[PDB]
Design a binder for this molecule. Structure first.
Ligand code: CA
Ligand code: CA
Ligand code: CA
Ligand code: ZN
Ligand code: ZN
Lengths: 604, 612
């Protein structure tokens, strides 16, 4: 101590006077900087980084929101976190992870049912309380033996108290958006939220077999928050990647089929009641001090073709009537390929069901169905007509994979070989393509199978299998017209990212239509599949209507399905009446934005 | 301030002070700039009397601060079933938020893993260990031991991975280093001492039931797997004259201390592939019975000898691996030559007269047929040996089968005496169902217990109480029956705690003696007052309980310490599903590496150091 100072005291007084004579007498700063530069020089920056942290005076422990970010974004249990916490605290003495109770006390801020809020005018048929979280999803549907039997389980939040917490976990993101867009921070204009709604059945959830059980989630997302300052509208907040895995928030879930129509209406009726309530109101709610006012715009878009065909009240997908957007039969599509419009709203379908029920013109079913254009049920969900982006691409992939298997067998020379040539054609196709591209033969086509197979190189491989020569022209021209056509709907913002193909798309599409109708009319002379109608005829109207096609798709809901199985398999109380509380709660906590701001700390 | 400046800027500022301190460092100390910078900066902080930063920086430069030495975070990763990438998520998040590298990165964690697996330490064998390779660093080798998968050969579709026996034995000896040093400190020997230590090692192989991960669709297939494992049970040493116990393993039939040696996805009853994969391990175990290990734990060379005991085989598998008849044999006990008739007759006096050498001799007698007898006189010439024995086993019992056999005799004794069948010897089966139904309703009405068909542990324990026989005894008249059943129940509760002791030399030495007395009294009363229970049927459990208990107690020293339900299958599924690769050839490598690394004593020390 004193003696070891006395060993090197000559340097001590030397460096001391050196620090007084030039650096003034700030001995501590120049000596610590000397130790930093002398310890970094031997490449041991770990000690220097922690020593800079201990001189800066930063705490060793963690805030409970960081601990909750760790416990949710890593899928630990609530019993293994206790293991990690107790032995970290025991080994390094000072605690770094918080205990479980201060974690759950910091959980209740981020769920629905914590904040005060009020509507103006108050909502009809909706309760006025502010502090309800997870309710039973059956909505008091009575289960006595005298009535209709039910056995499903469902949980949900309210709709308004979900939107309140979903707005106040992104308070920082709209405040920084107002700062970066040259607006005054103390503003309380009528903000408009744009909410994209999505619902998709995700069956085969069960774990054991011979009894498959299914499930249905109903979810939403925020997509654009916009204030009207002065005389213009500005995008205060915009979504980075809309159809992402972790930016759609769960709102209701149930264990039922997508086709059990009575149960599905019994659960999704109160949510549509609340949604139709909050379309003529203003939510006043504090956003950093002063209260602000929100007004919502709902677009229900993230439905696949079967769900959008069922709840909007149409005939099923194998109909004579194909388009959910227009009213033309499939025998009318193959003649006029691209000149259609969009004329299937929701209220039009509701009055057409009223026409079907009343039968006011006194005519039989064969012309009444033609008069109402195949509407034969009461539609009960307000949805906008659109096309998807995922299932469209997978459908086009399987369709010209089938045309590859057709063109191997040379049907243009002689038709109608029986169903024994075709299995050989399939075998030679996937054997050849596995030989060249190493693509394993898969029954259920995915999107990655599309991303590999939709390639000019594989076209050249099947060209090396198909005998003739002009078929290479009639196949390669088709494939590069399709590859030119794809990124106008695959893109998330094709108004600015690919504004070349988007302007050349009409010419590029009608040329494709002509090449399908001339050199391929041995398949498309009568029938045509649904997705070649949507991709060809409508998308230069959906672009000018909305913008993207890829942003308004169910890829988030389709990507979230593993989180159901994982959360249920590792984090649940195993009682089937609490078991859907916990899956919903964890899937709420996962896709918060206040927690993903911590797991991107290293990016900052 | 000078604090907030860039390191290039700070370099340009104090370049001359750096020149002066480095020139003093090589004009006085000879260029040890870090130590003199430590002294000057530490004293420049210490002069302001802020000792807290001095203690914290001392703990840093020692390394005892908030550091988490990589074995600790390896223990965290492997004992809470984290993956690899999710650990990387946790590490980069806590490092970016806190600023200091508190969790260690991946590659340092892998380098701290390689020390604990086999294939790190050098060693040698003082006799050079015939038919065993002499290299020191083989890890996981293919468990089939170079079999023939050729199509012209025998068909084989199993997957096996294993370590070598001597390599895994070296690693399991080197993993318990500090525990053996603290062992000889606690008995007050030197902390440096050459050998030889005698290492008593338990041997065990048993099945694992199912492992199928078939999500749903349809029941894909069974897929039964089985492992081969061992346990460093105790370690002794002598100092000239007297042995002394430097290590004793406290929880013997645990799950944390059963180190895996071989894993195969083969059925237990498939005999050929089982003995195919087990034969190299038996070759190495017969190799190391006559050698010496040189091992360099405390900086000095020490010598190790070994003793192997195979007590960890279940009773269905000791009758297969030693060559007895499988299940329906008249020869029931796996220690003596007693037929089922004499085991029904001579209840108490028996002695253990089976081994491995005379079993091999009896198999050769069955093969050679040296007396030209018929098949039946051959069968009672060799006392049940039909197959060729190939694993030296030392079989034993465990307490659950003992008191389950006692309860399954006592339940039928109660049903028989409750209806006075000793005077009415010819009953019909529905009358036995009637007696059973009266006993079931009366026991649920008096003791409030739901009876059941299959007999398990807690039901067999709580049925054998004094209040149970004194509650059922009022349903039978003729109080001679009451006092006789009272005497028999008192005899049973006297005979209970000897195999409920785990060390009966220290628990109950009074009841350890006169076990022959109470056992002969049990036989004399069960054949004297109950001279109607002889239906020619006696289980093997009741025989081993009544006859072969004191020979086992003098043999090993315990009863339920050298034996063995569902504890491994959950661990196998947890390691195969969460943290493993695919491809069926790396999959077994990863599950064997994790099942080795989970069961160390080093990592368990760091894990349950919270309640020290
Ligand atoms: Ca679907
Ligand atoms: Ca789906
Ligand atoms: Ca077993
Ligand atoms: Zn249309
Ligand atoms: Zn016996």
């Amino acid at each position: 101590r004193r003696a070891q100072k006395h060993r090197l005291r000559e340097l001590k007084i030397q460096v001391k006077e050196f620090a007084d004579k030039e650096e003034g007498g700030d001995v501590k700063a120049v000596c610590l900087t000397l130790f930093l530069l002398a310890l970094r020089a031997r490449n041991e920056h770990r000690q220097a980084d922690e020593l800079e942290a201990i001189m800066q005076g930063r705490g060793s422990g963690l805030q409970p929101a960081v601990c909750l970010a760790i416990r949710v974004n890593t899928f630990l249990s609530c019993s293994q976190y206790h293991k990690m916490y107790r032995t970290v605290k025991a080994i390094t003495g000072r605690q770094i992870f918080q205990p479980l109770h201060a974690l759950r006390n910091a959980e209740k801020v981020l769920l629905p049912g914590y904040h005060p809020f009020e509507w103006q005018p108050p909502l009809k048929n909706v309760s006025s309380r502010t502090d309800v979280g997870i309710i039973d999803g059956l909505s008091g549907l009575a289960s006595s033996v005298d009535e209709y039997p039910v056995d499903t389980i469902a949980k949900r939040f309210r709709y308004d108290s979900a939107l309140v917490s979903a707005l106040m976990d992104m308070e920082e993101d709209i405040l920084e958006g107002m700062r970066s867009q040259d607006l005054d921070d103390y503003l309380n204009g009528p903000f408009t939220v744009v909410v994209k709604e999505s619902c998709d059945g995700m069956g085969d959830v069960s774990e054991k077999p011979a009894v498959p059980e299914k499930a249905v989630r109903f979810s939403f997302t925020v997509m654009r928050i916009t204030i009207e300052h002065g005389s213009q509208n500005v995008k205060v907040f915009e979504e980075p990647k809309p159809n992402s895995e972790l930016c759609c928030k769960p709102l209701c879930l149930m264990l039922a089929d997508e086709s059990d129509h009575e149960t599905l209406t019994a659960i999704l009726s109160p949510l549509i009641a609340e949604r139709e309530a909050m379309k003529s109101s203003e939510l006043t709610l504090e956003m950093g001090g002063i209260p602000r006012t929100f007004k919502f715009i709902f677009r229900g878009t993230g439905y696949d073709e079967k769900l959008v065909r069922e709840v909007e009240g149409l005939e099923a997908s194998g109909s004579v009537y194909i388009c959910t957007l227009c009213d033309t039969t499939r025998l009318e599509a193959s003649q006029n390929l691209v000149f259609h419009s969009i004329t299937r709203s929701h209220a039009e379908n509701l009055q057409r069901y009223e026409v079907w029920r009343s039968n006011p013109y006194h005519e039989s079913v064969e012309e009444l169905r033609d008069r109402v254009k195949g509407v034969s049920a009461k539609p009960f969900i307000e949805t906008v007509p659109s096309i998807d982006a995922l299932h469209c691409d997978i459908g086009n992939a399987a369709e010209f994979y089938k045309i590859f298997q057709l063109e191997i067998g040379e049907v243009y020379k002689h038709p109608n070989a029986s169903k024994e040539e075709r299995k050989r054609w399939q075998a030679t196709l996937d054997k050849h393509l596995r030989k060249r591209m190493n693509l394993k033969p898969i029954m259920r086509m995915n999107g990655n199978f599309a991303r590999k197979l939709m390639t000019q190189e594989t076209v050249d491989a099947v060209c090396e299998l198909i005998p003739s020569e002009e078929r290479h022209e009639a196949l390669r021209e088709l494939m590069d017209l399709y590859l030119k056509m794809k990124p106008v709907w695959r893109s998330s913002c094709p108004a600015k990212e690919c504004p070349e193909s988007l302007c050349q798309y009409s010419f590029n599409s009608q040329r494709f239509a002509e090449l399908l109708s001339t050199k391929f009319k041995y398949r498309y002379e009568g029938k045509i599949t649904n997705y070649f109608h949507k991709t060809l005829a409508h998308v230069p109207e959906i672009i000018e209507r909305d913008g993207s096609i890829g942003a308004w798709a169910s890829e988030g809901n389709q990507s979230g399905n593993k989180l159901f199985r994982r959360f249920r398999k590792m984090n649940a109380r195993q009682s089937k009446c609490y078991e859907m509380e916990d899956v919903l709660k964890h899937h709420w906590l996962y896709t918060s934005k206040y927690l993903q701001k911590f797991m991107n700390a290293h990016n900052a």
